[PDB]
């Protein structure tokens, strides 16, 4: 299932637990950006997905502050878990930095990450 | 500043508690009990005091005890304080799909939340 | 109609002609970023929209190179024209910079611009 | 290196010409290539990219109307071209459908496409 240790295409490590209530909890370690060591993540997933072959919708957030660094920014990943021999979580993400109003136009980066339970 | 009730531009409301450890927890109401959903996210608990906003994000999976849309939305944005406080966000809404339909799985948009209806 | 001079919420100037064949042509002047004066734009729009009250889908691109500056980047706006007493073009945009492979993860900004024929 | 035929991860094809001063013009079609699947594309690219190893920024639009069909929608692709023996155009896209104002919240899909010179 969703619970386990995942890696994206760039080597970031996503350690997550999916609870019966639809909760996601865990830690994220980023291979890119103004980040070091582990950061808390929380999110939600559909705990009763369809039975027609569709994936399981989910999302989570990391605020890029821990006991060692603060980048004044947060990323959300939105996507779906696809089961099978090679389980996969396919996502698109938004990374918003705190900015002044004059700089808000350049506050948000966008991209896509794919996660598997094997390293890239 | 973040803790409390917020209203978007389209008739949605949420109530959130911003914890001292960076947690966001609360309830999102898209329009009655049947429209209330759990929300969970994170925010920068030590933002700059230089005029910059406070970065944050949260997720709602659209399942409750009454309904299930097999989908989830994430909002990514920043809180801006003061007399006209705002949470300015962009969002991604992913639906569970088959592989053949995955190309059309994700909608994108924006929401602005205020403390006054 | 779409043809005319439009302004976004930041005061950028969008001068566009919508041709009978679905073509958009014109110039863009940005209120923000590494930009000076007018840049070429081209795009497309639905020249026969639905008659059920729906807006008119459209999109356009600016590469941020002109005779004065080159930011090595390009923005695409995707949206729809909404007729009314206060005509409006509502868009979401992607701004991709040319980067190295190691920096590609942070190559693309995302935002939303709304245009009217009156300057705010 | 941009001019020619490109193929995405899901079968789609485009034939583009990159003009000297930054114009992109061409046709976007399905893998089958029948006339009913072909649409005009136009866009722009950086005609003087950096020389430090960075990609070439570009974008283009297709409105999904041709002489045969009209889906009342348009897609923009924003990305960069990377040359070499394994040349690529790496993009993210936005697909906006015409909607009423009440449905505007669900008007815009987002995704990503990677284009290569071989199928």
């Amino acid at each position: 299932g969703i619970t386990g240790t995942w890696y994206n295409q760039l080597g970031s490590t996503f350690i997550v637990t999916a609870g019966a209530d639809g909760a996601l909890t865990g830690t994220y370690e980023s291979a890119v950006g103004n980040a070091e060591s582990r950061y808390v993540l929380t999110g939600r997933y559909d705990s009763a997905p369809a039975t027609d072959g569709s994936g399981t919708a989910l999302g989570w957030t990391v605020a890029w502050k821990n006991n060692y660094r603060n980048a004044h920014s947060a990323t959300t990943w939105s996507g779906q878990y696809v089961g099978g021999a090679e389980a996969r979580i396919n996502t698109q993400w938004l990374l918003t930095s705190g900015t002044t109003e004059a700089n808000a136009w350049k506050s948000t980066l966008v991209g896509h990450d794919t996660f598997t339970k094997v390293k890239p």
Side-chain angles (χ1 to χ4, degrees), chain A:
Chain A
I2 291 162
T3 295
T5 295
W6 300 81
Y7 308 93
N8 76 2
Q9 72 285 350
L10 297 179
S12 301
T13 305
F14 167 50
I15 307 172
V16 68
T17 298
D21 56 322
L24 299 179
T25 59
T27 62
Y28 200 95
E29 185 164 8
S30 183
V32 298
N34 186 13
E36 175 186 11
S37 191
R38 293 181 168 177
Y39 295 84
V40 173
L41 70 95
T42 64
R44 300 291 294 169
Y45 74 104
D46 178 4
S47 58
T51 54
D52 62 1
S54 295
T56 300
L58 51 67
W60 70 94
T61 301
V62 171
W64 298 107
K65 177 192 184 317
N66 64 13
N67 295 336
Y68 310 110
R69 290 168 91 120
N70 193 351
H72 302 304
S73 65
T75 301
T76 62
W77 289 258
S78 181
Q80 61 179 315
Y81 162 88
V82 181
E86 180 179 22
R88 188 168 298 261
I89 301 175
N90 294 319
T91 70
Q92 293 182 90
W93 54 259
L94 299 172
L95 164 52
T96 303
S97 293
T99 67
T100 62
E101 297 284 36
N103 294 323
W105 68 272
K106 54 175 179 183
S107 66
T108 309
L109 292 164
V110 63
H112 49 99
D113 285 354
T114 186
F115 295 87
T116 65
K117 290 185 176 174
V118 302
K119 295 194 180 73

